[PDB]
């Protein structure tokens, strides 16, 4: 039972060793830059516990990483396995995909969920066990025989959960967050094997200060014009390299003055990597790392060439790359703004807010405090589940039946009780 | 519950009002506990419903692990949501928040 | 953090492409010191403008040429353009 | 300007149709309201 006590301690204490692991990796890579070259070695500045406490803190980091992922195994894994069972059962009942659909080659998630119906203990949380027999006997008459089949079918050798547990591992391994922390564990292990790349755990600043959903925020606003625009920039530079290679076969000198064994740009391949690596990272343009045009019968062409072409390239293209990236941040901040403001002026349930509700002092405050409050619906559902099915009142049983029917019009749309008076 | 239902379903009294403010520390003791909501009880009129809020659930819902999930759900609703699914996803949130409330309560 | 990650990578691989001296006939300066490397990359590559591809060894004739070109180009235009531009954007939007 | 016109083609088309030209304000109260408008009612190919 000590393991029960221990896992309940880790699940109750889960959201603190994330902060502890970030603090530990932060303090380790505070130290890790103290290197030099002899084969790599650490000096000694002030207090001679550098090597042993590096050893200690690497141990402690890896332990807190494995610690943390087992704590996450005992935590939210039931919630997501619950949500997946609920979706599977509530699409067997109101739709019956394994009756009729047998779904398409896309959305392989339900196709993996196909492997779980012939278990022993299918809806094992789901607040329930019942709906399996209900569905497979409500449909098991004019699709009879196969569904009646697939409904029923220390010293522990083969008497544990097999296929449901394999399905559970399959659903767990498709997670965002679990797979993220498992990669974090493996990087802890290999950085324990080699402390150079131990500093990859500063990437966990991606869940930094009051920015807890930054992974979804960065995944969402990817414009994907930018990939097409970088492609455009590459095409313009490639066109340029075609032109300059096919005419200007002498104005490139990587050497000095030609007394050294001079280097004239000729290789097409290199001519392209040269123009990227140099002319894009120039800033001043390709008119710098170039032959001066003094005294040549292509001077006018090369001046027009360079001036027009590469200020047309670097100014316009690099500026609008910069503009796309900064406008992504602008969209982040705008959605983070008009969540909060229109939530704090116009609630869910009314959906009109403080306009004709406005005239009461502390009006909308009283609305969200007393009237609906959005947890009183949740606590109401606790109450309206946890009583018996004979002791409801009229409105109470009415709301229960509309909930069971999936009708959804007992939430007051467009008017509330204070507005109803007149 | 009964006195609140009298005073709220019949305000604008003169008769009740002296009795209404008379000796009510019960109202002080039972405005953490009564939950009021609003529905439409098939008579096409908004009818407030009074009920009980369990004392083992204000602590269970005001603590973290769930208060964490609340803001995430509010963000995913108000960020993007059609005018019909609102409530169906809301009740899905309600049901698995019950499930998390249960398994956090066993901790 | 991005510059520190960079210093980790460049220190742990590119232990010859830094020369603060001239041509090596002078008693040449590779910046092996991790501590110095980091202050070097701040003080030089951030205050460069043109990027860290300037104060560097030229990659002509080396079997890390492709890696160092990809390294420099992608990494430091990704650093200076995006990060310094949005620092500038935050400060100007404060005035806004 | 490119992105703004590419935006306020789509949004005000998807809130207020051609033929009505008022859209989902007093038409709003029906669930799937404007969806039913453009599916059943006019649909712009049923004219064709
Ligand atoms: N229908 C509604 N349901 C829920 N909350 C609402 C509703 N209408 C308005 N609100 C707003 O939700 C806010 C909740 O307050 P607040 O955000 O300070 O506490 P919290 O939600 O516990 O905090 P956090 O959001 O950080 O978890 C109130 O300011 C209120 O204006
Ligand atoms: N009066 C109208 N005539 C035509 N379309 C309308 C009208 N009012 C609204 N619409 C919108 O036109 C849209 C048509 O849907 P959608 O664009 O997905 O299909 P489509 O027009 O075949 O696609 P595409 O525009 O890529 O050819 C609907 O979303 C509908 O909201
Ligand atoms: C036990 N139980 C139920 O029986 C139930 C429910 N939701 C609906 N029902 C019917 N929940 C959340 C629940 O826990
Ligand atoms: Ca009864
Ligand atoms: Zn409301
Ligand atoms: Zn119309």
| Rounded Cα distance, A257 and B48, in Å | 92
| Rounded Cα distance, A221 and A418, in Å | 40
Report the DSSP beta bridge partners of residue B12: none
**H or E segment and range at residue C31:** none
C61 SS3 class: coil
Provide the 10 A C-beta neighbour count for residue C45: 23
Provide the 10 A C-beta neighbour count for residue A397: 14
Provide the 10 A C-beta neighbour count for residue A114: 15
| A385 C-alpha to ligand 3 centroid (Å) | 6
Report the DSSP beta bridge partners of residue A208: none
What phi, psi does B47 have (nearest 5°)? -135, 110
Closest residue to B46, CB basis, from A376, A394, A415: A415
Q: At CA A371, angle to CA B74 and CA A353, rounded to 5?
A: 65
In DSSP notation, B82-105 reads -TTTHHHHHHHHHHHHHHHHHHHH
Locate A13 and state its tokens.
């204490």
Kindly provide the residue ranges of all beta strands, DSSP E only, lying in B13-102, ordered along the sequence.
34-40, 46-52
Per-residue CA distances from D45 to A108, A197, B6, C89, D39 (Å): 36, 62, 59, 48, 10
Resolution (A): 4.2
What phi, psi does B63 have (nearest 5°)? -85, 170
Nearest to residue C57, comparing CAs of C26, C10, C20?
A: C20
| Rounded Cα distance, D3 and B4, in Å | 56
The answer to whether residues C70 and C32 touch, using CB atoms and an 8 Å cutoff, is no
The answer to whether residues A193 and A202 touch, using CB atoms and an 8 Å cutoff, is no
Question: Which chain D residue has the Cα nearest residue B82?
Answer: D32
Nearest to residue C13, comparing CAs of C72, C53, C55, C54?
A: C72
Per-residue CA distances from B81 to B71, B75, B76, B78 (Å): 15, 10, 8, 6
B37 SS3 class: strand
**H or E segment and range at residue B1:** none
What phi, psi does A174 have (nearest 5°)? -100, 10
The answer to whether residues A74 and B64 touch, using CB atoms and an 8 Å cutoff, is no
User: For ligand 4, a single-atom ion, which residues have Cβ within 5 Å?
Assistant: A 390
Nearest to residue D28, comparing CAs of D36, D12, A416, A339?
A: D36
Locate A152 and state its tokens.
């029923």
The answer to whether residues A419 and A357 touch, using CB atoms and an 8 Å cutoff, is yes
How many residue pairs bridge chain A and chain C with CB atoms within 8 Å of each other? 67
Locate D38 and state its tokens.
């453009």
| Rounded Cα distance, B80 and A350, in Å | 18
Chain A residues inside the 8 Å CB shell of B68: 15
Locate B33 and state its tokens.
């506990």
Provide the 10 A C-beta neighbour count for residue B52: 16
Provide the 10 A C-beta neighbour count for residue C11: 22
| Rounded Cα distance, A401 and A403, in Å | 5
Contact residues, A window 97-136, toward B, CB-based 8 Å cutoff: 125, 127
The answer to whether residues A10 and A63 touch, using CB atoms and an 8 Å cutoff, is no
For residue A75, give every residue at least 6 positions away whose Cβ sits within 8 Å of its Cβ, in sequence order, or none.
A10, A11, A14, B65
Closest residue to A79, CB basis, from B75, B78, B96: B96
In DSSP notation, A248-315 reads -SSS--SSSTTTS-------HHHHHHHIIIIIITTSS-TTSSS---SS-TTHHHHHHHHHHHHHHHII
Provide the 10 A C-beta neighbour count for residue B93: 20
In DSSP notation, A126-181 reads TT-STHHHHHHHHSTTTTHHHHHHHHH----SS-S--HHHHHHHHHHTT-SHHHHH
Locate D8 and state its tokens.
């306020």
Strand-strand pairing, B34-40 and A40-41: unpaired
| Rounded Cα distance, C87 and A159, in Å | 61
- C62 at interface of A, judged by CB pairs closer than 8 A: no
- A415 at interface of B, judged by CB pairs closer than 8 A: yes
Most ligand 1 atoms within 8 A of CB, residue of B67, B76, B94 to mutate: B67
| Rounded Cα distance, B84 and B90, in Å | 11
Nearest to residue A386, comparing CAs of A132, A90, A127, A131?
A: A127
Distance of CA A326 to the CA centre of its chain: 20
- A282 at interface of C, judged by CB pairs closer than 8 A: yes
Locate A145 and state its tokens.
């025989």
Half-sphere CA count of B97, side-chain side, radius 13 A: 29
Strand-strand pairing, B46-52 and B34-40: antiparallel
| Rounded Cα distance, A227 and C49, in Å | 24
For residue A177, give every residue at least 6 positions away whose Cβ sits within 8 Å of its Cβ, in sequence order, or none.
A72, A76
Q: At CA C42, angle to CA C36 and CA C47, rounded to 5?
A: 130
Question: Which numbered atom of ligand 1 lies nearest the CA of A367?
Answer: 8
Question: Which numbered atom of ligand 3 lies nearest the CA of A403?
Answer: 8
| Rounded Cα distance, A150 and A380, in Å | 38
Nearest to residue C5, comparing CAs of A203, A218, A190?
A: A203
The answer to whether residues A320 and A229 touch, using CB atoms and an 8 Å cutoff, is yes
The answer to whether residues A355 and A367 touch, using CB atoms and an 8 Å cutoff, is no
For residue A94, give every residue at least 6 positions away whose Cβ sits within 8 Å of its Cβ, in sequence order, or none.
A406
The answer to whether residues B98 and B90 touch, using CB atoms and an 8 Å cutoff, is no
Report the DSSP beta bridge partners of residue B47: B39
Q: What distance, in Å, lies between the first and last C-alpha atoms of chain B?
A: 32
For residue A252, give every residue at least 6 positions away whose Cβ sits within 8 Å of its Cβ, in sequence order, or none.
A263, A264, A265, A274, A290, A291
Nearest CA to ligand 1 atom 12: A344
| A391 C-alpha to ligand 4 centroid (Å) | 5
Locate A259 and state its tokens.
């007394």
Evaluated on CA atoms A325, A327, A328, A330, the torsion sign reads: positive
| Rounded Cα distance, C58 and C52, in Å | 12
For residue A413, give every residue at least 6 positions away whose Cβ sits within 8 Å of its Cβ, in sequence order, or none.
A351
The answer to whether residues A226 and A314 touch, using CB atoms and an 8 Å cutoff, is no
Provide the 10 A C-beta neighbour count for residue A283: 15
The answer to whether residues B24 and B4 touch, using CB atoms and an 8 Å cutoff, is no
């Amino acid at each position: 039972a000590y393991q029960q006590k221990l896992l309940n301690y880790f699940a109750r204490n889960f959201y603190n060793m994330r902060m502890l692991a970030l603090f530990v990796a932060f303090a380790i890579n505070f130290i890790l830059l103290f290197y030099k070259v002899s084969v790599h070695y650490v000096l000694e500045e002030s207090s001679g516990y550098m090597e042993p406490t590096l050893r200690i803190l690497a141990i402690l980091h890896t332990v807190i990483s494995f610690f943390c992922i087992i704590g996450y195994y005992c935590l939210k894994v039931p919630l997501v396995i619950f949500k997946r069972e609920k979706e599977v059962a509530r699409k067997l009942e109101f739709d019956g995909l394994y009756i009729t659909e047998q779904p398409s080659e896309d959305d392989i998630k339900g196709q993996w969920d196909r492997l779980v119906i012939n278990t022993q203990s299918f809806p094992n949380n789901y607040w329930d066990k019942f709906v399996k027999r209900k569905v497979m006997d409500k449909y098991g008459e004019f699709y009879g025989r196969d569904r009646i089949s697939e409904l029923l079918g220390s010293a522990v050798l083969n008497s544990i959960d097999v296929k449901y547990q394999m399905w559970k591992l399959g659903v767990v391994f498709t997670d965002n967050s679990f797979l993220y922390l498992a990669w974090y564990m493996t990087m802890s292990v290999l950085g324990h094997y080699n402390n150079f790349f131990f500093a990859a755990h500063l990437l966990d600043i991606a869940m930094g200060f009051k920015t807890l959903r930054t992974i979804l925020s960065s995944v969402t606003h990817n414009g994907k014009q930018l990939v097409l625009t970088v492609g455009l920039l590459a095409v313009v530079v490639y066109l340029y390299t075609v032109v300059a290679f096919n005419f200007f076969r002498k104005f490139y000198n990587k050497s000095e003055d030609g007394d050294t064994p001079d280097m004239k740009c000729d290789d097409m391949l290199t001519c392209y990597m040269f123009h990227m690596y140099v002319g894009v990272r120039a800033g001043g343009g390709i008119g710098d790392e170039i032959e001066d045009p003094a005294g040549d019968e292509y001077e006018i062409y090369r001046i027009i060439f360079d001036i027009t072409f590469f200020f047309f390239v670097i100014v316009i293209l690099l500026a609008i790359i910069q503009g796309l990236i900064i406008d992504a941040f602008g969209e982040l901040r705008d959605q983070q703004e008009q969540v909060k403001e229109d939530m704090e002026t116009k609630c869910f349930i009314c959906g009109i807010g403080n306009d004709y509700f406005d005239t009461v002092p502390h009006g909308f405050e009283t609305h969200t405090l007393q009237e609906h409050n959005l947890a009183n619906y949740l606590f109401f559902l606790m109450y309206l589940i946890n009583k018996d099915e004979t002791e409801h009142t009229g409105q109470e049983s009415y709301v229960w039946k509309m909930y069971q029917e999936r009708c959804w019009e007992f939430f007051p749309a467009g008017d509330c009780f204070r507005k109803q008076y007149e | 519950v009964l006195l609140t239902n009298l005073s709220e379903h019949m305000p604008n009294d003169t008769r009740l009002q002296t009795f209404l403010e008379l000796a009510e520390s019960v109202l002080n003791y039972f405005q953490p506990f009564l939950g009021r909501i609003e529905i439409m009880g098939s008579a096409k009129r908004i009818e407030r419903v009074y009920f009980e809020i369990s004392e083992s659930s204000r602590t269970q819902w005001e603590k973290p692990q769930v208060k964490e999930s609340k803001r995430q759900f509010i963000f995913d609703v108000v960020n993007e949501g059609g005018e019909k699914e609102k409530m169906e996803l809301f009740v899905n949130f309600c049901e698995d928040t019950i499930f998390e409330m249960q398994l956090a309560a066993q901790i």
